[PDB]
Design a protein around this ligand. Structure first.
Ligand SMILES: [K+]
Ligand SMILES: [K+]
Ligand SMILES: [Mg+2]
Ligand SMILES: [Mg+2]
Ligand SMILES: [Mg+2]
Ligand SMILES: [Mg+2]
Ligand SMILES: [Mg+2]
Ligand SMILES: [Mg+2]
Ligand SMILES: [Mg+2]
Ligand SMILES: [Mg+2]
Ligand SMILES: [Mg+2]
Ligand SMILES: [Mg+2]
Ligand SMILES: [Mg+2]
Ligand SMILES: [Mg+2]
Ligand SMILES: [Mg+2]
Ligand SMILES: [Mg+2]
Ligand SMILES: [Mg+2]
Ligand SMILES: [Zn+2]
Lengths: 115, 207, 122, 119, 52
RNA sequence: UGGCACCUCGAUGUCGGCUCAUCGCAUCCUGGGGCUGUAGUCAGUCCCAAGGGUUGGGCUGUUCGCCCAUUAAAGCGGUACGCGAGCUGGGUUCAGAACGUCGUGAGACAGUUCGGUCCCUAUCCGUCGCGGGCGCAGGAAAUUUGAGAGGAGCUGUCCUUAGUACGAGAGGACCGGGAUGGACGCACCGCUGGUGUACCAGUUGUUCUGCCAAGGGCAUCGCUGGGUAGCUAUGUGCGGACGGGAUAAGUGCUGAAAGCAUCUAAGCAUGAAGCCCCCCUCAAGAUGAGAUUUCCCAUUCCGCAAGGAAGUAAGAUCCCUGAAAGAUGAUCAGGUUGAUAGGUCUGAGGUGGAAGUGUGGCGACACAUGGAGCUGACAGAUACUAAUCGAUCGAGGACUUAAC
């Protein structure tokens, strides 16, 4: 990585976000803005992917909503996330949990690992 | 018309105040030096000659050193001209710095596109392939060379050949941030050329 | 990315279960539709005794896609299926209930009835 | 990037492992200039393992070095010599354990030949 | 495709202009005095950078 | 559709489709207008206009045509009914077989049907790219002007003007602002993805490293889950914007010839997506070989001169380390007062918790040591290795006139 780009983007990196890994369950408090007014919408799901480095790092959270799985991908350091809570620490064996895309119900469970 | 020479450092992204995520290209422009002012009287046209990126003495030759002697500066690796500039606002030896631009300003960016070597009609000219199955033996070929009547191929029948490495201008890019301390320009979007390649940032000609 | 021959689930109770995309509207050579775009489609599977019947040519709006949609803030949303809602020309749905989550993008395209009816608008 | 040396991946890996053990045993071999240039990086990274000396490093090297006798009198294998003689020789040298010296073209195919040896 | 007309002796010779060899890039070996190729070890005496 | 039989029977391969286009205008859309039995919205017809654009399917070998769904529009023709040494080979007209029908028959069509070998290594011109030589009145290093050439040229919907003008209502503007798309093009890999055969991990069979443990070979990279650089689109940024000049059809002003009238004869305007520019790219071999800045400096030989030869200057090359470049040349970054590549060290990203040991379990295995170990191309640092010594090329500037 170039050292210059790290310095330029350093100010905009967020420092309050908790450490989490693929497999953990997160409540992402997303600042939804419909114009003048903004309302925090919570998206709770499993972290299935976390790629990239520095200011360009992103992560993907997956949940089943009304029978349909939904995945949301966010920039890790985006100011549009108000807060992230790690609800649960999951025991997984790989960085990308793509296999969860084909599973549903009991097959899609992630073992907990008390941190 | 404003302009400055710089090196392409790479791309990253920046969050705007309203939360938008803007991709930016980082251009590093150590202060340029005005090496020569050309005039209509002496040269037939008005232009400013900017030197950029001080070259090691060993790499510079004697003709170069003499040319930059009047500006009282180290030899420069990259020399370019700018036309359309306010001649009176510039003096030989003056340093041109990134702070001539400001955030939000619209600029054109010139560079040499990355080379791709010898490329076929499909890649080089975005032509269509033939069928891949149903007996086809025509896949990545450049198509009929033309009608029979002329007994020759018309000029401009596009064919394989060396691709990339041409001078290319992208117009109407926005300056996102000017880091005077580090001599950086953050320009929204991407610009031609490989990393470390010379980039020219001028005030937009369509403004 | 919905195109001709794409089959979609229907996310309402109009009577159609599955539709096949006939045409993506909104420009001469337009190849692909995304969330919020209106398509012409035929009803391939229908619920017996529904308002819409098998073999009808209807208009629908795409409310979910696997490809999903990128947002200005740099986030994305994807779903595991492609679903649409049968609509009239005034953009009201022809059914009365919407099933499953729908994307926020429908508010931008003024499908307000669908958004209000959806069990979740993400 | 890296060179393919006109061989598939499996053949190329096999040749590079052969050359490495050959160079460890003899400390100097003549080969084609391009083969020598590729060998350089491979062998030097093996020498780094020898300098580390720990069992984990040794097993990484054991996975690469061919099982060939380096010195019949002691019954010393290439891997033992690597850890016991090569590493000891270059304990205080930071990188650059080999040098390439170019010979003329080889008769028969005009191949540019080279000497590669431990420095 | 086959040649429509034979090639003249002039056209043949004009083509072969660039079909040429170059003199080798020689430099005297300062140790033994034999000529070697620049940047190659001397075959004759085995010297390089003033070392055998 | 024909008439003729002038070229081709020591061979000018066919219909349809595919790839690639190019031209005409008798204009399908977009632009500008006259007339209207043009209220408005729409239209009809004629004129100017070829800049750009001009869809995806069902049926059929099909062209065509009908149909489905769109579009601003789904234009008409020429180019050997453009394009088979560019592709396909479904139709048709080789050999097989069959039906109907005709024939005494072999067989045949006034009809069908199933199956049936598409050869060629590009010499020349042409076309797209890349070099070497010389030239351009000294020898070099850079920066450039632009004669000239190429590229681009498309358009929808919505909001506002305004439910205004218009109309009895129904409906519903011009012009002028503003937003956002489709198709198309350029660039780029930060984002979303693809690839990633010298990256990480899991796992099957068998064989090998003496055995255990840990590993290697082979099985499509054995298979499977990820993935760095690079290359990428379906991803992202941007473009066709503002306008000038001269015009077309048209509209005119002043104005006689011809006391009036008249756009025209003198004279003065206006007026198109079109023309010339503006915008992008190439461009001095533009032999008319241009211009500017800087550097080198008048050497040594001979010959009566003309001129020739030899060392060099500035500078460049050979050779060497390479990649941001690349088929090869070339281009670019470097060649020891050098970070050019490799290695080494420190990182990033990637994988996902190494081996050894200990503990828990009868065991498979789990946990701790420990975000561990490993890591191709990415970043920074570091002369440890290789860029040695050398060789080759490269000016001394013609004559005439004019002004100094
Ligand atoms: K009969
Ligand atoms: K990418
Ligand atoms: Mg990561
Ligand atoms: Mg094939
Ligand atoms: Mg001709
Ligand atoms: Mg194999
Ligand atoms: Mg006759
Ligand atoms: Mg003949
Ligand atoms: Mg013939
Ligand atoms: Mg006409
Ligand atoms: Mg034809
Ligand atoms: Mg032909
Ligand atoms: Mg056929
Ligand atoms: Mg010819
Ligand atoms: Mg990258
Ligand atoms: Mg075992
Ligand atoms: Mg075998
Ligand atoms: Zn010698």
């Amino acid at each position: 990585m170039q050292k210059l780009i790290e310095d330029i983007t350093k100010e905009q990196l967020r420092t309050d976000l908790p450490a989490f890994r693929p497999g953990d369950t997160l409540r992402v408090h997303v600042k939804v803005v419909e114009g003048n007014r903004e309302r925090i919408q919570i998206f709770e799901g499993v972290v299935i992917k976390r790629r990239g480095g520095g200011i360009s790092e992103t992560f993907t959270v997956r949940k089943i909503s009304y029978g349909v799985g939904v995945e949301r991908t966010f920039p890790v350091h985006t100011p549009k996330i108000a807060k992230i809570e790690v609800v649960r620490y999951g025991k997984v064996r790989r960085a990308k949990l793509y296999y969860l895309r084909e599973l549903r119900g009991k097959a899609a469970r992630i073992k907990e690992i008390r941190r | 018309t404003k302009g400055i020479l710089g090196r392409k450092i790479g791309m990253t992204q920046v969050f705007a105040e309203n939360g938008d995520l803007i991709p930016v290209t980082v251009i590093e422009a150590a202060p340029n030096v005005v090496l020569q002012k050309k005039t209509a009287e002496n040269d037939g046209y008005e232009a400013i000659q900017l030197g950029f990126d001080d070259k090691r003495e060993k790499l510079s030759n004697k003709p170069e050193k003499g040319h930059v002697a009047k500006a009282e500066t180290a030899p420069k690796r990259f020399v370019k001209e700018l036309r359309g500039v306010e001649m009176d606002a510039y003096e030989v030896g003056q340093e041109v710095k990134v702070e001539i631009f400001s955030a939000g300003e619209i600029v054109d960016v010139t560079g040499v596109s990355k080379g791709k070597g010898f490329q076929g009609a499909i890649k080089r000219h975005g032509q269509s392939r033939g069928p891949m199955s149903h007996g086809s033996r025509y896949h990545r070929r450049p198509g009929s060379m033309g009608p029979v009547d002329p007994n020759r191929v018309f000029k401009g029948k596009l064919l394989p050949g060396r691709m990339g490495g041409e001078q290319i201008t992208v117009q109407n890019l926005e300056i996102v941030k000017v880091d005077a301390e580090r001599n950086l320009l953050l320009i929204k979007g991407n610009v031609p050329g490989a990393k470390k390649s010379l980039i020219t940032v001028k005030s937009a000609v369509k403004s | 990315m919905i195109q001709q021959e794409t089959r979609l689930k229907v996310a309402d109770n109009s009577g159609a279960r599955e539709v096949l995309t006939i045409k993506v509207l909104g420009g001469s050579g337009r190849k692909t539709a995304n969330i919020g775009d209106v398509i012409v489609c035929t009803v391939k599977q229908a619920t017996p005794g529904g308002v819409v019947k098998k073999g009808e040519v209807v208009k629908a709006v795409i409310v979910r896609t696997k490809s999903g949609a990128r947002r200005s803030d740099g986030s994305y949303i994807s779903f595991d299926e492609n679903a649409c809602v049968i609509i009239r020309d005034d953009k009201s749905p022809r059914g009365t209930r919407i099933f499953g989550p729908v994307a926020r993008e429908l508010r931008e395209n003024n499908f307000m009835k669908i958004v209000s009816l959806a069990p979740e608008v993400i | 990037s890296y060179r393919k040396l006109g061989r598939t991946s499996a053949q190329r890996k096999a040749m590079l492992r052969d050359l490495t053990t050959d160079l460890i045993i003899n400390e100097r071999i003549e080969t084609t200039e391009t083969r020598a240039k590729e060998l350089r990086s491979v062998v030097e990274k093996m020498i780094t393992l020898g300098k580390r000396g720990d069992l984990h490093a040794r097993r990484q090297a054991a996975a690469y070095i061919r099982n060939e006798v380096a010195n019949e009198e002691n019954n010393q294998d290439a891997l033992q010599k690597l850890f016991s003689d090569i590493a000891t020789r270059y304990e205080e040298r930071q990188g650059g354990y080999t040098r390439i010296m170019k010979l003329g073209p080889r008769r028969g195919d005009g191949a540019p030949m080279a000497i590669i040896e431990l420095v | 495709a086959v040649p429509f007309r034979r090639t003249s002796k002039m056209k043949k010779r004009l083509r072969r202009t660039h079909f040429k060899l170059n003199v080798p890039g020689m430099t005297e070996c300062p140790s033994c005095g034999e000529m070697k190729l620049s940047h190659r070890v001397c075959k004759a005496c085995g010297s390089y950078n003033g070392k055998d």
